[PDB]
Write a protein that binds this DNA or RNA. Structure first.
Lengths: 46, 271
RNA sequence: UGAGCCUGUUUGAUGUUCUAACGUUGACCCGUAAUCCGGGUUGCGGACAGUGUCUGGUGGGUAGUUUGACUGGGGCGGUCU
RNA sequence: AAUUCCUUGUCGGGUAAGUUCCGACCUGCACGAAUGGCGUAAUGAUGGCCAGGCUGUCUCCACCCGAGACUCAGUGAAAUU
RNA sequence: GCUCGCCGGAAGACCAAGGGUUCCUGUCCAACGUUAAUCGGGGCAGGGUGAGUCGACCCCUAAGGCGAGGCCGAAAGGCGUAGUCGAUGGGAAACAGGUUAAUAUUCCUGUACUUGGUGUUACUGCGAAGGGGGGACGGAGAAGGCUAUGUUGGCCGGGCGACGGUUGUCCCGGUUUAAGCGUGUAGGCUGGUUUUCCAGGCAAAUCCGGAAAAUCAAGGCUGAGGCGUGAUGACGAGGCACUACGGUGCUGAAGCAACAAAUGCCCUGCUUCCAGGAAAAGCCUCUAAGCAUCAGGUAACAUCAAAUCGUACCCCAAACCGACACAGGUGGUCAGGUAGAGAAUACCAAGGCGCUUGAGAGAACUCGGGUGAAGGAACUAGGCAAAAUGGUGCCGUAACUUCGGGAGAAGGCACGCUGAUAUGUAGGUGAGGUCCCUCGCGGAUGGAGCUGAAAUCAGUCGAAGAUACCAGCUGGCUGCAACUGUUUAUUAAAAACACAGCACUGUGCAAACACGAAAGUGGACGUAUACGGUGUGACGCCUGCCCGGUGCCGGAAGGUUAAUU
RNA sequence: AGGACCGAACCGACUAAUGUUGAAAAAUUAGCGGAUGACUUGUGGCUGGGGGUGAAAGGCCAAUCAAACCGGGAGAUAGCU
């Protein structure tokens, strides 16, 4: 039976990537929050 | 001509067609074409703003001349053509200087005829003049509402307008809805009426025929729930309320026009 | 044409006319290599239309809530000083 | 009657025997004309009833071929208390 | 190693997406593997991916995204012009053989092709951000020409059979060869050349569009296959000498014809229909400002260049999505033999597997199946489940009907093998030989060789000849919805929803209506034979009376009535 | 010619048995409907929560829908256990 997750790298990067986060004011807030918490990986980009 | 189909299938039993043998079988003139994409009834916000639109056949746009400038140069008719964007046929015309154009085809126009525009043209179907120069009591189509703008009235298959009176700088017109209206006497018009008057004698026959033209199904408000329409609900079949639109405005009688800017040009509303 | 002051003046209402505010999703020129925008010339409307503050009507389109107790279960009936 | 409580109404047909079925009567508790009335060839994994052929559905169950259940060696859970 | 069994339009082979060392060699068996393990997609160490021509990058755009100035909005911000991005689409060029434990159109051998820079020589009007051509486009149908590929004969090499026969009308195996270069065929489309003139293509034009004369009747474009060369080459059963068991050196026969034939190619073709079927660049032409000694253009030679990233392995699955070595899900390409209408079904070829606990016994009961005396729905809410019919050709077929249907209505008869008609028929294909002509991939005649249905007559075997797999049960009366379609992912597929048709009502274009504090956008590059809302639901015969109540439309005399004064 | 007929690939889900700490958090085996069209499928794009989309079942919006998920007001309030 078909399931929910169906991968695709182009779509992943266009949806949750670094440049997508930087293009908007709220994405910068996501990045600031994650930097303040101290995560080792900041986005989904390799 | 109008032709009935034979009942070889339940989807063919009720089909009536309009067949015309004089239309061109071939490709249209290329230097007068453009692309046209579909919308689905959606605007730049991405929301449906008009219901029941979607799908259909692919179409290309033909550039038609509604201004009819170029006075003094005769033109000859080359052929008549089918157009998917409107309900009237079009005609290809060639000028004496070597230029080609598309125009609306009136009733009775064949290949090999002549046409002209200007103040000193003749009174025959297909010619264009300002209405200051047309005898009162005449039948016209493709009428302007401002001098130099292009035709905007009586452009559909089989329609026309009547010139009823003239007084000063204005003329009075009777329209297809039954309205009397005023327009400046310096506007332009074409003699005759629009052709393809059998367009209203066709029966589609099956649901796929409407789907071929980009029309989607209509769902009645009485078949919904109360959260979707003011007409929804019930245990069985119940109405018990005055009919309204999906947004709560009464249908079946209430009026809706409100424009004080243009009220000085209407002489009598449609009856 | 109706109201005040010594025919004349002040101020209302009604109806024609005009251009200079204002409108143009008519035509032409430039910025320009551009069916947006601005400026210039010219037609058509014209103190109307439209917007701000105040004010009467309509308004389940949307929102916040009320719809009592006794009772040989509860509702219906009866009752509450 | 996809509508009728009294009701398995009364009469006729089909069965040896028919509260369901088909044709009629009119006493319509409480049908009825675009929240449509009465009909209708073709179409339907749609509701009801009758026939031919066919049979382990049944009187009433008997034998056989394979996979488990049973014994030996290796691994090795669960709800509850 | 020998035997047995299973799949074979897949349970074989090659990819995209996704994963990322799972690939090859040596060594180890604690943990992982539903059991043992000397084995592994497990632990440890080493090795393995070679490009001018395959892809990406690059040139060009679709839907959509961002957007200098600009318009709009308490702030944050929204929409948009000139521009710039974005493939699932358009744009130059390579084939066959050999080789490693693991790579190959990349490495080696042979034979090819494309695009740019520079130099020398010989002729010469070149020049764009602009004008014109081309690229460039739908569904369905028919039949002519071909190839991939198969069967048989001829040829070459081998054989003479564990039990009766087998020197022959016998048995087994092979019979392969590309791109490029020359030739321009079956066939499709279109009349050719010269001169003069002109309100059109923003300006110009020798290019396109238009008009009037003369002249010739043949010019041009497109095009599968075949033939020649490439090839005195490569490959090829087998033989001469040893094996590290992977192989080395050499040698090496035949290598032709007929018939059948695609869903692939000619074909972006041809015929026909209405619902009327992308954009931009690469490419070919035309001139403007400008340069004219120069610069630039066309052709021949010589030389230089073509960088950077991917390339191992799985890919209907034990490596991807499902917590698992999970009976589930996942787009493209290739298509052998016998019987068959067939990509169905049965048995096989190349190729790949027996699904990671076994060994015994032969109780009740549960699961999946085969057979049944006499009866034949008596079972049960209900013929639920099972049993039964099933092919091709011919005969024959009712009420009713919108004249198409109902209809495969119903019910019947024949069907295998051998001989003759005919040592293989009616058809299909087609060599030699003879003539004709511009001489070629030409035309007429001619019939060798090959292939090959269906019917009739006379015989013959069994209980049974559509013998296996495969493969409609049929008739009579009635309710509902006209019909094909749609729906409650995971207890409801229906009489529920939609529908073609009908009627009422709004709407004069800066339309009504809808999304938006606004700017703006859809409706529509449409204009009352058009567009939006509401109810009924093919077709036939029809659709009666009520304006007192609640709504909507028209009126304006009288009563009541806000801010303001 | 045809929202024509029979039937594989492809797309669905009418009946029965098994399974219910399943091989499977919706499947398997034997039958069943459509199959040139209102058909089916690959890659990318747009619509955002009192909002979307809906041939209309209160259906669907990441195993969650008569108002999604995550963080905050927050130790909301609980005459009740």
């Amino acid at each position: 039976m078909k399931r929910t997750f169906q991968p695709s790298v182009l779509k992943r990067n266009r949806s949750h990537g670094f440049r997508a986060r930087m293009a908007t004011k709220n994405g910068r807030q996501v990045l600031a929050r994650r930097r303040a918490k101290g995560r080792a990986r900041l986005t989904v980009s390799k | 001509a109008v032709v009935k189909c034979k009942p070889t299938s339940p989807g063919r039993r009720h089909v009536v067609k309009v067949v015309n043998p004089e239309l061109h079988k071939g490709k249209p003139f290329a230097p007068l074409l453009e692309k046209n994409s579909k919308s689905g009834g959606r605007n730049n916000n991405g929301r449906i703003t008009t219901r029941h639109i979607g799908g259909g056949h692919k179409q290309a746009y033909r550039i038609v001349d509604f201004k009819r400038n170029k006075d003094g140069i005769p033109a000859v008719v080359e052929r008549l053509e089918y157009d998917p964007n409107r309900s009237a046929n079009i005609a290809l015309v060639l000028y004496k200087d070597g230029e080609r154009r598309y125009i609306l085809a009136p009733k009775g126009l064949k290949a090999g005829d002549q046409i002209q525009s200007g103040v000193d043209a003749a009174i025959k179907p297909g010619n264009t003049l300002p209405m200051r120069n047309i005898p009162v009591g005449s039948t016209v189509h493709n009428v302007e509402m401002k001098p130099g703008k292009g035709g905007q009235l009586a452009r559909s298959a089989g329609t026309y307008v009547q010139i009823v009176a003239r007084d000063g700088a204005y003329v009075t017109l009777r329209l297809r809805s039954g309205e009397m209206r005023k327009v400046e006497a310096d506007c332009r018009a074409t003699l005759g009426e629009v052709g393809n008057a059998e367009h209203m004698l066709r029966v589609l026959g099956k649901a796929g025929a409407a789907r071929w033209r980009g029309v989607r199904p209509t769902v009645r408000g009485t078949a919904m729930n109360p959260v979707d329409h003011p007409h929804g609900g019930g245990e069985g079949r119940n109405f018990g309320k005055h009919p309204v639109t999906p947004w709560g405005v009464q249908t079946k009688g209430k009026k809706t026009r409100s424009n004080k800017r243009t009220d000085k040009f209407i002489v009598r509303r449609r009856s």
